[PDB]
Design a binder for this molecule. Structure first.
Ligand SMILES: [Mg+2]
Ligand SMILES: [Mg+2]
Ligand SMILES: [Mg+2]
Ligand SMILES: [Mg+2]
Ligand SMILES: [Mg+2]
Ligand SMILES: [Mg+2]
Ligand SMILES: [Mg+2]
Ligand SMILES: [Mg+2]
Ligand SMILES: [Mg+2]
Ligand SMILES: [Mg+2]
Ligand SMILES: [Mg+2]
Ligand SMILES: [Mg+2]
Ligand SMILES: [Mg+2]
Ligand SMILES: [Mg+2]
Ligand SMILES: [Mg+2]
Ligand SMILES: [Mg+2]
Ligand SMILES: [Mg+2]
Ligand SMILES: [Mg+2]
Ligand SMILES: [Mg+2]
Ligand SMILES: [Mg+2]
Ligand SMILES: [Mg+2]
Ligand SMILES: [Mg+2]
Ligand SMILES: [Mg+2]
Ligand SMILES: [Mg+2]
Ligand SMILES: [Mg+2]
Ligand SMILES: [Mg+2]
Ligand SMILES: [Mg+2]
Ligand SMILES: [Mg+2]
Ligand SMILES: [Mg+2]
Ligand SMILES: [Mg+2]
Ligand SMILES: [Mg+2]
Ligand SMILES: [Mg+2]
Ligand SMILES: [Mg+2]
Ligand SMILES: [Mg+2]
Ligand SMILES: [Mg+2]
Ligand SMILES: [Mg+2]
Ligand SMILES: [Mg+2]
Ligand SMILES: [Mg+2]
Ligand SMILES: [Mg+2]
Ligand SMILES: [Mg+2]
Ligand SMILES: [Mg+2]
Ligand SMILES: [Mg+2]
Ligand SMILES: [Mg+2]
Ligand SMILES: [Mg+2]
Ligand SMILES: [Mg+2]
Ligand SMILES: [Mg+2]
Ligand SMILES: [Mg+2]
Ligand SMILES: [Mg+2]
Ligand SMILES: [Mg+2]
Ligand SMILES: [Mg+2]
Ligand SMILES: [Mg+2]
Ligand SMILES: [Mg+2]
Ligand SMILES: [Mg+2]
Ligand SMILES: [Mg+2]
Ligand SMILES: [Mg+2]
Ligand SMILES: [Mg+2]
Ligand SMILES: [Mg+2]
Ligand SMILES: [Mg+2]
Ligand SMILES: [Mg+2]
Ligand SMILES: [Mg+2]
Ligand SMILES: [Mg+2]
Ligand SMILES: [Mg+2]
Ligand SMILES: [Mg+2]
Ligand SMILES: [Mg+2]
Ligand SMILES: [Mg+2]
Ligand SMILES: [Mg+2]
Ligand SMILES: [Mg+2]
Ligand SMILES: [Mg+2]
Ligand SMILES: [Mg+2]
Ligand SMILES: [Mg+2]
Ligand SMILES: [Mg+2]
Ligand SMILES: [Mg+2]
Ligand SMILES: [Mg+2]
Ligand SMILES: [Mg+2]
Ligand SMILES: [Mg+2]
Ligand SMILES: [Mg+2]
Ligand SMILES: [Mg+2]
Ligand SMILES: [Mg+2]
Ligand SMILES: [Mg+2]
Ligand SMILES: [Mg+2]
Ligand SMILES: [Mg+2]
Ligand SMILES: [Mg+2]
Ligand SMILES: [Mg+2]
Ligand SMILES: [Mg+2]
Ligand SMILES: [Mg+2]
Ligand SMILES: [Mg+2]
Ligand SMILES: [Mg+2]
Ligand SMILES: [Mg+2]
Ligand SMILES: [Mg+2]
Ligand SMILES: [Mg+2]
Lengths: 63, 96
RNA sequence: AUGCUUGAGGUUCUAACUCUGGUCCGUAAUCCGGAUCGAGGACAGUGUAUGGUGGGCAGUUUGACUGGGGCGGUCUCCUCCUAAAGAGUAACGGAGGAGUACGAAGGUGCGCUCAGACCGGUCGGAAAUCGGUCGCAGAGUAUAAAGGCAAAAGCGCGCUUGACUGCGAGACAGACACGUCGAGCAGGUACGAAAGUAGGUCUUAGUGAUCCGGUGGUUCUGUAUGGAAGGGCCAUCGCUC
RNA sequence: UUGUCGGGUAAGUUCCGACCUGCACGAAUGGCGUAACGAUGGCGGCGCUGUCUCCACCCGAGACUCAGUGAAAUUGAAAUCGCUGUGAAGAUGCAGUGUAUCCGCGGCUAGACGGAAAGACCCCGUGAACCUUUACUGUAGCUUUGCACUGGACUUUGAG
RNA sequence: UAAAAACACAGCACUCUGCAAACACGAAAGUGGACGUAUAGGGUGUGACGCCUGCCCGGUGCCGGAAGGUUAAUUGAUGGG
RNA sequence: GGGCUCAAACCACACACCGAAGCUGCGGGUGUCACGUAAGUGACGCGGUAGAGGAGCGUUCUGUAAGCCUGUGAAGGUGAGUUGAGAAGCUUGCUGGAGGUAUCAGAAGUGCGAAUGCUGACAUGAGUAACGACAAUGGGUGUGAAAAACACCCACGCCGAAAGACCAAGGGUUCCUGCGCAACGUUAAUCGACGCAGGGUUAGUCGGUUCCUAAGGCGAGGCUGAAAAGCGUAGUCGAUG
RNA sequence: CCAAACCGAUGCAAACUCCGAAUACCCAGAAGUGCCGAGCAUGGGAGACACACGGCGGGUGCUAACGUCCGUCGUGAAAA
RNA sequence: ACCCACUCCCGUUGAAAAGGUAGGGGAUGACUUGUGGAUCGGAGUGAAAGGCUAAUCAAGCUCGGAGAUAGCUGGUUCUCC
RNA sequence: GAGUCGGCAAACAGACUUUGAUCCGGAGAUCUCUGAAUGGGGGAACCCACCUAGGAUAACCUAGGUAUCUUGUACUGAAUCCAUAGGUGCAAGAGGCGAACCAGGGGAACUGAAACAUCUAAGUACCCUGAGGAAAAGAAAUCAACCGAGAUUCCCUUAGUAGUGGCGAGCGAACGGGGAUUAGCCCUUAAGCUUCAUUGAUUUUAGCGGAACGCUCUGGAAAGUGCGGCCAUAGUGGGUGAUAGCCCCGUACGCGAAAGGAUCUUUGAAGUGAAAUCGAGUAGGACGGAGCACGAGAAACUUUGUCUGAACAUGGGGGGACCAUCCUCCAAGGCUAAAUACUACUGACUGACCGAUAGUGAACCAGUACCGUGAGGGAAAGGCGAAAAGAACCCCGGAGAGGGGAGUGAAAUAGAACCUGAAACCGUAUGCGUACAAGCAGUGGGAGCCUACUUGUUAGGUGACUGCGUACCUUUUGUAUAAUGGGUCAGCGACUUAUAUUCAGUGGCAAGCUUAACCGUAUAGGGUAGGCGUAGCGAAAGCGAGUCUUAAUAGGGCGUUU
């Protein structure tokens, strides 16, 4: 049968021309103790690291 | 996704965004594709006849990608500033 | 209060219901059913909903390291040594700390320089405050150690909120996720006459991913449409996980 | 701890009697006694004896030989010695050396880490089973009340 | 591979049970208890007999009580959208 | 180890020689680069587990193939020779007696020594242990191919609350007679509960059946239960009586 | 009769340092040699994550162990 | 007699998947025994040993789910570079 | 249309048949006993009855009837007056079996989640019920989205998307589109369906005819060799003594039914659909469940165990909380073909399927033998030859077993345990070696001897003596290891397949490429719905060679020059 994409991976990794976007960790619930610089530089999307692409590419059924 | 029992990357990172249900009926037609339509009038049904958009597509937008070969009329189809200039440069026109 | 809707206890009544009570019949029959008498009686009992109880029974969990295992200890973070003069580097190797604190103990401008000793001096003594000489950091630096500290980074005072918002060239570090430093630009400030300084604290510990839920905003979305709900985005809260 | 004392023996870690310092007895998970009973545990004696000193002789049945029939476990292949070393650390097989003509039969079990059973002890596996409980989460059953089956009346009970 | 000191036992005691008994097997009907009826029946412990069986009710269980607190389904006042 | 002492020990120096799959020589193969638009030359390489990369052999089937080979001898089997770096190929003697398959492609149940692998055959142990109650045999005669075991006779020994005679259960022809001995019989067998054939079992009274019931079963209706069913009344079976 | 400080002589120290190499490491330039390449990037396929001994520097142990734990090199692993 | 199974020896590829010889216990009883019947798989039955339920028992056998799962052990077949 | 009395499996007997047998097909007759088993009983294949009618006089015989339940009907009929319950007769029907498919009731666990409880496995396995050749469903109180579609069922897509999920492992749509089929009828009573006539068509169950070849060589035998022909709407069929278009049976093609079955049809007849008359304990609601992809979630919708409970087209349902507006439909009554599922069974055809350890467990007297109390488990075992021509006769031997001749046959070492006839393993014969010699048994060197021709620079066999040398596999840091595995041989025995997908190689086409289902005198061609690509950025609205962040057109992220 056809391959089933991992639901959790698809909710965290958007495919754009240029890689897979994802948000950052450590921005959820303990933020007063974090500097503004740290919280501002942990904001936005980012491309997936080279070493994690094949693993995530397999979690999604794109390989 | 199995990392040996370590918290997997597909669970360390947060879920984000929502999918757009409103964007499931839309399509983008390049200016290089407008000349492949039949009958000199580019429309919703005429683009489906030319097999340039899917049958379910309900709203179309034209963006500047390629050269408009021939003058055509865009009837009920939106366009970008660059696409609109290119279409009218080739002799085309827009209708509501 | 004559009269009026209806809750909760009690006492009666019989007509539901119950009888593993008598009698008659089906019937050649201790089942059963019907009739009738008697006894209870809206109770009991059963369905459904609900609280309690419940190893009677079931499904399971009950960590790892480890000079075998168990017992004891340890598990994350910081400092020193091991560590072989770049970085890194193990042992149930040798030693200590952390799970905070501070709206001032932050910023700035201005000003100052400790510890200790000796001599003199009311209580006053080894040691309190005062004066003088030496002293030159042996003090201090919220806190463990190490590395720093004269433009003191130590101490005092005035004014303050830069413990700002968006960012960010470029690096260090690094399996990843995280982490560290940061010139400069814009906005808006504070202190200073000004050049300037300020994106916390001399530095290095003081910490916890995701999911889920909560709160404040939001030009996003809104299952016919307009709303709304719900969702997204930004900010933030809840783990001795 | 074979406690100490007494008895029993030539000599008694056992036994019997006692002491009390009961590591850590104790009163229906009964305490302490107790005639009778026991293929019950411990200890002593008489008798009796090949149990033993210490074995001898004898009688049957095997073993042994002949004729007939005819298994077994095991087995990588064998031209399958000792010793001292070496070596995955205890050697028929390696090194050095010694001894040693070839092949049976009766015997014996020192070795072939001899055969037999993928050690049962021990540890491990995010194995199993069954058992326990104030482990967790459930649950049969038992129990509480609401509603239904389920009604009449009279009386103590709030607001309209 | 264990015949025993284990189990049973007569006797003892505690407790439950008023009969459609408790209790047990059964989705239930029914059946056992028992064609019995507290001198009976079940469960529990002890274990002929003799002398006896002491103290503790704090814990847990069981029994009794119900003033107070807390407490389910249910009902739906009120407030906020 | 033998043995060794102006050493065959030790110290110093020197000149020889031995010694490897190292190096060189000679012949061959192969990898990668470069020159070659060629055959080939040049240089440097060529131990190897896990593992990656490359290039092949062979087997069965399909197409090529209504072809080709084949009774003047196919496949298979068993020897010999020969060719290639190898998997392997080719030629041929014998056996065999009717099928085989060139070449190039295409498909795979495609290659075995291990799995205490599975099935069959056959070894080793080994002509070894054993021949199943230590109640016991001896002789004569016969028959027979053959007699310790069969039959008969004369003796001996064993059981005799059985090792004798029965009834039941269970078995099922094993009973008797003729013929027979391959296998079966733990040896032989002429003998047999063995092989082939024939024969043999006679009931009013024995035992069943029939009559009657116990425990218990089933059970019309009936009561109960998701269904399947459970229970049970009237009945109807059910001996061990 | 003991003894602070100071003075002089005199030793020790992984967690002492007024000093302080060799090496090693980082960077730049340069010749030749690389077997035709060493370097880096991207991608396809892994295996491996039980190591052992020897030397050297160490901890630990008794400067015991064919011990144990690191660093570093060599060999075995996988090499006759 | 019958039922049983305390001791020794033998036997242990046994005559025997639990026996035999010699001794041993009960032997009118809570006895032994035949025939028929009832109770069984989280179930029965148990003078209680986790005993027994067809040489099988801390949950029988048989078929099915089923090729359960096996981070474990074993094995994995022609050639060359 | 000439043989026959079935097979193992023949031998003698006795017969039948051109007065048409055997054989094949249709229709009849008979059809013991058991089994739903049905008169009662029962340990299946057995025991015991009764009633009616007839016929025997003895101890019976023939024929029929005698189960239960449901439906209907008739007669009777309690407690209890009428009744009713009950009882008796009659008529019709049912029961049981069968591999799968269908609808429904009940419903696991292992497993996965690298533990495990929610979840998964899965509404699966299994148990049970009912029906039919199909079943079910089915004619919008349905979607959609302001445009419209127009019952049901099935296939391909949409799409592993939306969503769901200890947001873990997993589960997983719909809208829309392309197809296959096409059908709608009624409750003011129909389309249909069933049965019985009836009119014609086929079809099935036996059969008939069916072309055309000779010589020659080898050979046991010709179909093969060589030469020369003929048939073909028949040429790659099976046999026949080796390989056959022309030898036989067949094949293409053309005919054929007394009788039965079946399917289409044309009319007719009743029967049914049939619930009557438009849907009330219904819609809605509360609680607890189940299903919807949806696990309570903000949870619509369906369904119902408990409890309640409307309106009447000026009404009601839905459009995924909910409200308003709009759109769309009319529930609580029914019937309905086709496309779809399956094959225990029958026939034909086919296979880059097997070929006796394979293929069914079973090629053979196989669900047998055997094992088990039983449920159940469950084998092994094919080949003489063309033809039995299966060995007359003689000899040894026990009137044996087995052999030696003879004979048959092409061949007997094809002799019945029979094609071929491998290996392990066991022998006999010959050659060489071997009884002073230590070990993975070989390898390097090497004398002698023997054999054969090539007569010694040869081939083969053996191999004294001597250097070196501790099997293999596995597993390991490391194995001669005294670690593992193998007694040996022969046969079998382990990286497959499907569907999605990525990368590489090699092709087609190229800003395009490609179809799926499906259609298709069918590997063609059509079908371009869909998928991928030609544009990105952003969570998204959106903008777009840009976009996002931001006050910022500044910086920065990603993208754009193929
Ligand atoms: Mg947030
Ligand atoms: Mg299209
Ligand atoms: Mg009640
Ligand atoms: Mg438990
Ligand atoms: Mg489980
Ligand atoms: Mg551990
Ligand atoms: Mg360093
Ligand atoms: Mg260093
Ligand atoms: Mg003073
Ligand atoms: Mg002073
Ligand atoms: Mg400070
Ligand atoms: Mg809306
Ligand atoms: Mg919001
Ligand atoms: Mg004493
Ligand atoms: Mg004493
Ligand atoms: Mg006690
Ligand atoms: Mg007491
Ligand atoms: Mg006692
Ligand atoms: Mg006794
Ligand atoms: Mg002998
Ligand atoms: Mg030794
Ligand atoms: Mg011996
Ligand atoms: Mg052993
Ligand atoms: Mg083991
Ligand atoms: Mg015993
Ligand atoms: Mg007791
Ligand atoms: Mg030399
Ligand atoms: Mg050499
Ligand atoms: Mg060389
Ligand atoms: Mg050369
Ligand atoms: Mg080399
Ligand atoms: Mg190599
Ligand atoms: Mg072949
Ligand atoms: Mg083999
Ligand atoms: Mg192998
Ligand atoms: Mg022997
Ligand atoms: Mg012997
Ligand atoms: Mg013997
Ligand atoms: Mg005998
Ligand atoms: Mg003989
Ligand atoms: Mg007798
Ligand atoms: Mg006889
Ligand atoms: Mg014999
Ligand atoms: Mg006989
Ligand atoms: Mg019954
Ligand atoms: Mg009945
Ligand atoms: Mg009877
Ligand atoms: Mg009797
Ligand atoms: Mg350099
Ligand atoms: Mg590891
Ligand atoms: Mg490691
Ligand atoms: Mg190491
Ligand atoms: Mg070591
Ligand atoms: Mg080690
Ligand atoms: Mg290795
Ligand atoms: Mg006695
Ligand atoms: Mg026990
Ligand atoms: Mg047993
Ligand atoms: Mg179990
Ligand atoms: Mg399964
Ligand atoms: Mg398995
Ligand atoms: Mg009958
Ligand atoms: Mg019957
Ligand atoms: Mg009456
Ligand atoms: Mg039926
Ligand atoms: Mg799991
Ligand atoms: Mg039918
Ligand atoms: Mg139908
Ligand atoms: Mg409309
Ligand atoms: Mg013909
Ligand atoms: Mg032939
Ligand atoms: Mg209606
Ligand atoms: Mg409803
Ligand atoms: Mg509704
Ligand atoms: Mg809506
Ligand atoms: Mg309708
Ligand atoms: Mg077979
Ligand atoms: Mg064969
Ligand atoms: Mg002849
Ligand atoms: Mg043949
Ligand atoms: Mg043969
Ligand atoms: Mg000699
Ligand atoms: Mg020897
Ligand atoms: Mg040689
Ligand atoms: Mg040697
Ligand atoms: Mg080891
Ligand atoms: Mg070695
Ligand atoms: Mg070995
Ligand atoms: Mg050995
Ligand atoms: Mg072995």
């Amino acid at each position: 049968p056809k391959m089933k994409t991992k639901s959790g991976a698809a909710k965290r990794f958007k495919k754009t021309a240029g890689g897979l976007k994802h948000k950052h960790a450590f921005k959820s619930h303990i933020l007063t103790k974090m500097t503004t610089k740290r919280k501002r530089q942990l904001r936005g999307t980012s491309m997936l690291n080279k070493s994690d692409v094949a693993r995530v590419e397999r979690s999604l059924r794109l390989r | 996704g199995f990392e040996g029992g370590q918290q997997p990357l597909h669970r360390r990172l947060p879920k984000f965004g929502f999918v757009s249900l409103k964007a499931m009926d839309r399509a983008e037609v390049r200016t290089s594709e407008l000349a492949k339509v039949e009958g000199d009038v580019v429309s919703l049904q005429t683009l489906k006849d030319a097999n340039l958009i899917n049958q379910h597509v309900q709203r179309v937008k034209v963006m500047l990608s390629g050269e408009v070969g021939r003058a055509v009329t865009l009837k009920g189809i939106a366009a970008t500033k660059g696409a609109r200039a290119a279409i009218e440069a080739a002799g085309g026109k827009f209708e509501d």
